[PDB]
Write a protein that binds this ligand. Structure first.
Ligand SMILES: C[S@@+](CC[C@H](N)C(=O)[O-])C[C@H]1O[C@@H](n2cnc3c(N)ncnc32)[C@H](O)[C@@H]1O
Length: 264
């Protein structure tokens, strides 16, 4: 099934098009991300329709952010490694192509830490910490829509007590020298937030610093740049680890560096 899909669609599609039907897909809650060959375009909707029924999802988006192929409701709750993540699959990014990192995050924190998530999303990286590590968490999310989900996801996981949330730009965050650990899960020229990061950090704090660097420049970057910017503040940093992740071309990785900073 396949089989079931092939039995239904073979009735409406010439055998040549049937052969090209989608063989994989991504499922997030009850929404389906479905990739489609160009020759199947004319039949977009009907194919998404049968896939929807045999796979048991309410909505199908094109994988290819996303084009609605069948259904209407893109909000769903996705469960991963014991975590509940409500989201609007069409408006908010969330790839299991990153699940390892979300798993990793479940381990790294100690119950005592204050953790600040500078780019919270719906709780991508911070929920694992609040739930498994048990530290406290201040989660910052700029987008008001995304924010609703983050707030909700906090209840859904029963951590409203130890996790708080602010709908502002991380640069306006009043805090200073509070953070034992900072999450910088963002990849658009994130070096630009290093200064607010260092401000929010305590001396010795750990920073999970995500960025997108060309492999032309590895393994020098993105650490050199993190290093030099830190110099502008007379602080130092030690590189504790550098994981590769969604190595997503053309030619550019997505890495996360674990770094400890010292406020002199
Ligand atoms: C949701 S994470 C993406 C994680 C990744 N796509 C994944 O699958 O795990 C990026 C978030 O940072 C937020 N953001 C961007 N700039 C921000 C800022 N200056 N202050 C606070 N949040 C910001 C965006 O609203 C977005 O929700």
């Amino acid at each position: 099934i396949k089989p079931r899909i092939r039995e239904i669609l073979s009735k409406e599609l010439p055998e040549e098009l049937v052969k090209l039907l989608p063989k994989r897909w991504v499922r997030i809650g009850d929404v389906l991300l479905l990739p489609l060959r160009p020759e199947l375009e004319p039949y977009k909707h009907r194919i998404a329709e049968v896939y929807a029924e045999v796979l048991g999802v309410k909505t199908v988006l094109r994988k290819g952010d996303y084009e609605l192929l069948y259904g209407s409701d893109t909000v769903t709750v996705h469960v991963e490694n014991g975590i509940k993540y409500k989201l609007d699959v069409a408006k908010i990014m969330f790839s299991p192509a990153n699940v390892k990192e979300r798993v990793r995050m479940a381990k790294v924190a100690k119950p005592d830490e204050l953790v600040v998530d500078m780019f919270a999303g719906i709780g991508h990286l911070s929920l694992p910490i609040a739930v498994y590590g048990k530290a406290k968490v201040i989660a910052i999310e700029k987008d008001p829509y995304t924010f609703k989900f983050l707030v909700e996801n906090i209840h859904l996981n029963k951590v409203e007590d130890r996790m708080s949330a602010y709908n502002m730009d991380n640069r306006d965050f009043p805090g200073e020298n509070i953070a034992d650990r900072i999450l910088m899960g963002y990849v658009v020229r994130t070096h630009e937030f290093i200064p607010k990061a260092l401000s929010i950090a305590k001396d010795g704090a750990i920073i999970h610093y995500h960025n997108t660097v060309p492999e032309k420049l590895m393994p020098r970057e993105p650490f050199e740049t993190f290093k030099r910017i830190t110099k502008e503040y007379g602080y130092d940093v030690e590189k504790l680890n550098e994981l590769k992740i969604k190595r997503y071309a053309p030619g550019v990785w997505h890495v996360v560096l674990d770094l400890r900073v010292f406020k002199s």
